[PDB]
Amino acid sequence: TEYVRRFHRHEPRDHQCSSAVAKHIKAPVHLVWSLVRRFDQPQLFKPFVSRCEMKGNIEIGSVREVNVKSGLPATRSTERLELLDDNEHILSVRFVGGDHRLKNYSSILTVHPEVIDGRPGTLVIESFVVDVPEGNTKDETCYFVEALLKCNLKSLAEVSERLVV
Amino acid sequence: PVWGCASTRGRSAEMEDASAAVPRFADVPVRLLASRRDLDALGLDADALRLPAHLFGVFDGHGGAEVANYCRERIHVVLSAALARLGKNLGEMGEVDMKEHWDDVFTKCFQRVDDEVSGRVTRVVNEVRSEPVTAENVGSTAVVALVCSSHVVVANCGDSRIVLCRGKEPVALSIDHKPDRKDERARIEAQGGKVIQWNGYRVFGMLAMSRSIGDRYLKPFVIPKPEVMVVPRAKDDDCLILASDGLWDVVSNEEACKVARRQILLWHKNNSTDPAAQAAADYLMRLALKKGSEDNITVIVVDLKP
Ligand SMILES: CC1=CC(=O)CC(C)(C)[C@@]1(O)/C=C/C(C)=C\C(=O)O
Ligand SMILES: [Mg+2]
Ligand SMILES: [Mg+2]
Ligand SMILES: [Mg+2]
């Protein structure tokens, strides 16, 4: 929660909602970050990603076109890399396209060092602010985004822990 | 060969639908079909008799095709074994209500296949496996129809559908498990889940169905508990139709029945699967494409007239 106020404080306008989710991973920070930082390959840990196309090298302003698997209310999303800080291990992305209903979606993901069971571990925190789509409440929006992000982090933890013993 | 089956990737990139057709896939204990006092008048013992049956299944996969494939490979095996055990146990029961036993066999069958997909029980591969079959966001609908000379028993799980065409009129044999259905929403919200209208009513705004195989990431809100229906056959029956949402989203039950009756009749007037039923399945698949279906399309037509 000391990390939340420094890197995850959002000021959602009234027509918006903001929230966060966390996950403890039993793996070192450099490994988790090495997976997250690969902005061009989110399906490395993101379980709902079927494909991902990004052109050129990774840089601020890079845009990736993501296709998601079936069983979801959308099929594609277009995302731009806004922040990729390797020193502080911060990754910020904005949804700039897609056929979904998360307009002006912005997410901040940070990776912090932790001690899990007396061994090196990682605390991952992802926060977001988004517009509440017509016909939905702020709570509905948050339960949706939180369900999705909880899947993403769980998967990230399985991938990371599967690479460390 | 009493059936036809048509399948298409459709406008979708990958194929995630599957379907099974297992003739004589098991022998049904006659106790589940007639009464002891009903067979004794003939001099026969319902406990020993066996009626060979066929199994037809449609499995609309999502998040991957692994779970629909697995269903296609396992449900008929598990259900055959279960009907054997139930054939033995029923000889030591005395006249009871069979419907409960159909529910028991089909519910335990689906729940079994689900535990196999979820890595909660160990399975055989002839060797053993216990790790989950696939990722936790993969699942599949499963609508299966057991057919024999007397009964059609249906087990439905998901948004696939089976429609019985009888006397030139449609009779729904399964009710789509859409999460906005009163009982489905009530059960999900009672367990702490939420049903959100997000491009349709969906569980946590994600899955547009409340029951399915797999999807262990939405448990216990998405359950593999099927709805079973035991339907005695009548000489007035025409045929049976199983299919994925790729057909029922653009075609209705009425039109599907009218179309299937017409097709089979025309084939017989104008002249491995059965040619007439196969013609009906191809015509329904291509009708769903012509009506603009962007999902995988899977259709099975079972001829019920001799
Ligand atoms: C899986 C998912 C479902 C949707 O309806 C929207 C969208 C297409 C964006 C998609 O990626 C959204 C993913 C989210 C919320 C976060 C992420 O993955 O980082
Ligand atoms: Mg599907
Ligand atoms: Mg549908
Ligand atoms: Mg479908």
Q: Are B143 and B161 in contact (CB under 8 A)?
A: yes
Cα maximum dimension of chain B: 60
Q: Please name the method used to determine this structure.
A: X-ray
How far does residue B189's CA lie from ligand 2's centre (Å)?
25
How far does residue A107's CA lie from ligand 1's centre (Å)?
11
What is the residue whose two structure tokens read 């698949």?
A: B285
Residue A105: which CATH number?
3.30.530.20
Residue A43: CB atoms within 10 A of its CB come to 17
For this entry, resolution in Å reads: 2.8
Domain residues for the domain of A105 are: 1-165
Report the amino acid identity of residue A20.
A
Best of A43, A49, A72 to mutate (most B CBs within 10 Å, chain B): A72
Q: Count structural domains, chain B.
A: 1
Q: Residue A144: its chain B contacts at CB < 8 A?
A: 196, 198, 204-206
Domain residues for the domain of B150 are: 1-306
Q: Count structural domains, chain A.
A: 1
Spatial CA neighbour of B137 closest among B61, B60, B225: B61
Atom of ligand 1 nearest to the CA of A68: 1
- The SS3 of residue B143 is strand
Interface touch A144/B198, C-beta < 8 Å: yes
DSSP string, chain A: -HHHHHH------TTEEEEEEEEEESS-HHHHHHHHT-TT-GGGT-TTEEEEEE-SS--TT-EEEEEE-SSSS-SEEEEEEEEEETTTTEEEEEEEEESSS-TT-EEEEEEEEEEETTEEEEEEEEEEEEEPPTT--HHHHHHHHHHHHHHHHHHHHHHHHTT--
Instruction: Report d(CA B117, CA B107) in Å as an integer.
Output: 15
Residue B174: which CATH number?
3.60.40.10
Q: Which two tokens stand for residue B43?
A: 């001099």
Range B117-141 burial, b when 16+ CB lie within 10 A, else e: bbbeeebeeeeeeeebbbbbbbbbb
